[PDB]
Design a protein around this ligand. Sequence first.
Ligand SMILES: Nc1ncnc2c1ncn2[C@@H]1O[C@H](COP(=O)(O)OP(=O)(O)OP(=O)(O)O)[C@@H](O)[C@H]1O
Ligand SMILES: Nc1ncnc2c1ncn2[C@@H]1O[C@H](COP(=O)(O)OP(=O)(O)O)[C@@H](O)[C@H]1O
Ligand SMILES: Nc1ncnc2c1ncn2[C@@H]1O[C@H](COP(=O)(O)OP(=O)(O)O)[C@@H](O)[C@H]1O
Ligand SMILES: [Mg+2]
Ligand SMILES: [Mg+2]
Ligand SMILES: [Mg+2]
Lengths: 473, 468, 469
Amino acid sequence: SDVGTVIQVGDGIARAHGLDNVMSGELVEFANGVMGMALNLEENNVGIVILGPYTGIKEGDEVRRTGRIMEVPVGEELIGRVVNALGQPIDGKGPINAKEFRPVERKAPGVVDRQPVKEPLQTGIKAIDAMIPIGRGQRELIIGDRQTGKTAIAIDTIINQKGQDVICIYVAIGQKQSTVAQVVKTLEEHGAMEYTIVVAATASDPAALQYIAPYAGCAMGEYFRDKGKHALVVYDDLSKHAVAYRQISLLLRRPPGREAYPGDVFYLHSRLLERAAKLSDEKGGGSLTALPIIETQAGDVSAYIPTNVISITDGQIYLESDLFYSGIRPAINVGLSVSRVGGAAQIKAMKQVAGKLRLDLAQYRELQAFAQFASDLDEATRAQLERGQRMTEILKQPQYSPMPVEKQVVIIYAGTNGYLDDIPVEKVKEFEDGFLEYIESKHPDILEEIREKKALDDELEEKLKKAIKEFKA
Amino acid sequence: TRGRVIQVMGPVVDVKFENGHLPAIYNALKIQHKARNENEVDIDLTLEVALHLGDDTVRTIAMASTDGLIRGMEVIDTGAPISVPVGPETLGRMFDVLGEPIDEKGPVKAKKRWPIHRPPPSLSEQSTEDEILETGIKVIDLLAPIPKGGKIGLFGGAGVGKTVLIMELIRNIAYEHKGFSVFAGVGERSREGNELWLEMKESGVLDNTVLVFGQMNEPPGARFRVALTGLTMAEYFRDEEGKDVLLFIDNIFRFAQAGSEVSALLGRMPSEVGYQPTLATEMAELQERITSTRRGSITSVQAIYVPADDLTDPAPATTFAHLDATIVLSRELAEKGIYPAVDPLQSTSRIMDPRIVSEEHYEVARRVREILQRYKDLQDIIAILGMEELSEEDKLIVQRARKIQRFLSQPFHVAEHFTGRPGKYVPIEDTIRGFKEILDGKLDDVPEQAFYMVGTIEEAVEKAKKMK
Amino acid sequence: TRGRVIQVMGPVVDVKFENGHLPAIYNALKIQHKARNENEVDIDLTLEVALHLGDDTVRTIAMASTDGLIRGMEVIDTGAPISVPVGPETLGRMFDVLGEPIDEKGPVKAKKRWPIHRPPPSLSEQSTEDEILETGIKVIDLLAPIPKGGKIGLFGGAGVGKTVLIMELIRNIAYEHKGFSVFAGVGERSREGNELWLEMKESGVLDNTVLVFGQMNEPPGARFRVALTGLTMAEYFRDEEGKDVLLFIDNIFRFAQAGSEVSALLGRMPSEVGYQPTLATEMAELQERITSTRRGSITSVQAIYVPADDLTDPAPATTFAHLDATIVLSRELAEKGIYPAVDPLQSTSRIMDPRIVSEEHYEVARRVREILQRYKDLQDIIAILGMEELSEEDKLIVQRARKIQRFLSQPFHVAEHFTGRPGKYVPIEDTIRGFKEILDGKLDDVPEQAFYMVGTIEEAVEKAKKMKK
Ligand SMILES: Nc1ncnc2c1ncn2[C@@H]1O[C@H](COP(=O)(O)OP(=O)(O)OP(=O)(O)O)[C@@H](O)[C@H]1O
Ligand SMILES: Nc1ncnc2c1ncn2[C@@H]1O[C@H](COP(=O)(O)OP(=O)(O)O)[C@@H](O)[C@H]1O
Ligand SMILES: Nc1ncnc2c1ncn2[C@@H]1O[C@H](COP(=O)(O)OP(=O)(O)O)[C@@H](O)[C@H]1O
Ligand SMILES: [Mg+2]
Ligand SMILES: [Mg+2]
Ligand SMILES: [Mg+2]
């Protein structure tokens, strides 16, 4: 028969007899009306994971197979709204009239279905866009300790997509209802909700929903990619998603491994993150880029889930608790962070100036190990120290302050060619804003040419026009 | 509907029932038995249903000692979870985990009883208020301002000062707001709990306060459910009366350990450092209910014990995600005599933004955190090379950081037995003015010893005069 | 004969066979089911037998997703391990772990299929004729020569240059050695398989190369058996065609992590830092089958990820035992613009003896490691005290080390698009002659900038003039 009955009930897990023809991953319905997924198939029982309040289910209750895989609604109708892990509305603004539904579990695009990533995904952040570039189909990891600025980089990146054809999907996993509501008001304040979808599995929600959340957010991002548009997907913390899976697997009695996690956990995140890709022209040229986030305990990057996800991504941004209290505010470790796509992702103008910045910083990192004494260091060593201190300052940026790519180019160009070298270290931050206001207010042709050609080659005027500012301000 | 005890294993008891008459999860059961002969003992015990096992059997957690239980004893089903009295009749009373009164005052006779397990507020009921609660404590008011309606967490090992810091906050905040107050005391000391009750009973503040205790010496069933009894009483004033309330909890770590002690006996597989697989879910069932809504507000001060001084431990680690402000207490500061011993580089709050606090406050806090980090980065160089080898800038940075770390110290009113000084209250204006005056170098010609144990900057200057 | 599915738990499946006989260990099983009604899904799955359990039952590791499986589904025994196509028809084709073609070009139609699990060559079939395989890469051919029939390992962190160095080596063998190459993408990122396939399809190198990938998103059983598929295809060219072939394996770290995940799934007790108890046995089953025999030779280039800069981790540590030569790539050289970014002081090989390579080769490589080490012992003094305080001998030693450090840099053909530099191949005679002329102090009145990215030393000498100096 297709009818089963409950034989044990615990913390979101139930076990049942019968259900002989159920399939792995199928949805099952309890007599109370609540739903669950058939995860383990045994000789005489089925292990079911509950998708709601379990306190109403008792031993001897009837359970029925639905014959359906887990699916979520998709389309243009989800834009500027907040939904749970099953796509149901929680913003209080009424029903969602989506015309199509997609399973949360689908295969990633093949090797021949792809094309190399050649176009930039501007974050508006001078340390990322110059030294750790992101392309429009790349997976970049944001990693560091608690309270170091991890969500701020993801939110500033979503806010910068206003004048660009990118749909943004923000997936909150294991977050407090109060921080979700605080982030949603920040997105409305900056107008980012005109192109943003928010998916949220709260800390109060069962582990099964916190497990389904990244896959649902990914399915919504895929719809735009399959139709030739661009999409960005953020996972607020993959560490809480791994913890949610550890809970279900231990309660289902699957054998543990490293750091108590199930052996299956690499396949969990790799089956997710490989769905972010840039398609070939025969498939439509569409794209989906991902920004997963991970939290490290006391700086331990060598831990199981961190090393696992570091090996899956195409680059990593490292955040230091040390830089953050020292007054380097975005707090990015530029000498450790890396992107493979660097160069290919950037525009011709940005790449040129990124190069000199890279050599200057590399040399400064070599010299700073013994920078403890400076009155004794040779004057030549001082040139290396002074330049490095100034390039560090240009990278400092206030939260919610994305700088446009032409301006990032114009300022890195000035620091790398020594035009900011003569300015005093404390005065550099002031000089940066004043120079950008001067270039935009009078002779705006420099900013207009860089937007159109994207390749510079017109520097004689930029030099002469800069000397008129430095003459008295 | 009745059943019988089948097994007894410390805090855990297994019970078997009649065909299809099984109790639901979280449901309360009662054991009332009188000794039939001199070999038995009288028992009055309450059990909570934890899980269904098959063979008409249920596994449960006992709320009091299981000593004297015998296999085959009759058990009765109450038909609902642990239910506790709610309403204005509960103000000025002391309670047990089961909501029964500890004080000799008589029966409460409240109009309604609420179940200990309730769903939290939905996303549309949440609030986004950004209002500063002034504490009068010079380190919290600068580096980690407390948001009204938010959660503030005190993290520390054994004997660093968590209880002395909670009791100074109780004294300073409950003085001027005159709202309803609740204290849970989940791991609170009976001696301190007695000192608190006597002061509140003589000062009249008890008439607006609810107390629940649940001492260290109790079994894990009581240490596990007691935080929810105090919270269920504080929720009534927010939901049905629309009031603004203070909820104090001396220890939420004990709530986590009580779940750990229980987990092995329930039949669960252990996780990292022996903890339960459900640790983050259990902490969220408690912490998601402690929020401000469109009806009223709950502000909460909580203390978290850090075992073996390791913040990477699953219990303290799981808790940080839920707090709006986090205060970490360091042994290195306590062993050096600097109290309250709050670590300036690890303490933070949600409210520390240029959009929520003044430009002068933001700039002073920035300059304090930076000078202390620069001083922390130099204690190795000062150990390897003589202090006469450091540059003039680093030399001044050390002297200013030395003055600042002790100007962060303050004598509390609740600590007069330990500090030997009267006790002081400092307003935000004098904290900002004080640190700015040291950072700007106006006080370079003043000894470091003059900044220790003084409430305000004018005091530091007369403390310098009291010494030629 | 025919068996039935009994349990399903993630990538692990249990099967009962009853009548006839049970399959052998490592034997391949097939599931082919058509939906009987609209509530079911069609399934095409391959399983590998791992252990016998009793009650006419066997435990297996799935090669693809187990979603949609049902208890009681019929299972078929193929009577042998996973079998893959072999022969010249496999050249210029992309493959899956099961040997099925990924590319839309059609069926491969090969004449024979070989099993993935075969015994290695015996002590009698071992050859001892050591010699050198010329790569045309100026750092490897001098400091860490590659033995024919030997194994070379590339160690480093993320973004150092391991895959680009592997892609340039594949090109050079197809250019002058005219040999057949195999690349095994063990746990390959699908973004990188696309870039390898495009470089080889446009440069023409693909017609002489075999690509085996699978995907990093496939279950652990597939990520574990894929390196054996590339090797079983490389064995046919040595044994049945008598050729000398090069096998490239990108990141055996993913191979080690995949055996760990399979052992944890099967229920084995974790060993040191949570790896499988069988790590050394499993690594060796792959490394031993790669050897020079009396029929021909298989040589191999392997990349190894060093997690958190720790070379003491079980995965890198078990690999070092089977390496004739070692290359360590330093992130500090990569960010300073020096490519291929190989550390001259940590790279070594076993064949670096006067009895296997020329006296002039041995003497130059010794003088290079020595002058570099001497310069490393002085860079503290050069920074704290004025360079005007260094003696005449040490001053010249520093300048020569400075020219030699950049002379190790070389522009690659596969990397011409990034920088626009044409690409160079340098023969062993010119690498030895180049470093000898710098070490002997003949070429001193030439600026350091002339030795960066140039190929042979005559090209550095003309470049000095091109820079008007
Ligand atoms: N560039 C910046 N300039 C100034 N302050 C910043 C900057 N970036 C982040 N902050 C501040 O840092 C604090 C923490 O930021 P955020 O919440 O994004 O960090 P997080 O690492 O994601 O924290 P959590 O782990 O709790 O989620 C906030 O007060 C934020 O305003
Ligand atoms: N603010 C303070 N002023 C003076 N002494 C303090 C202060 N805070 C802590 N102490 C001292 O240290 C101990 C703190 O005890 P308590 O607050 O209960 O520690 P904890 O709860 O962290 O275990 C007391 O003995 C007290 O004398
Ligand atoms: N020879 C080179 N010349 C210039 N850039 C290079 C060169 N080799 C590597 N790179 C740069 O560094 C990246 C190396 O990435 P990858 O090959 O994946 O490194 P790895 O596997 O060691 O982590 C390239 O994508 C390119 O940006
Ligand atoms: Mg966050
Ligand atoms: Mg205390
Ligand atoms: Mg790599």
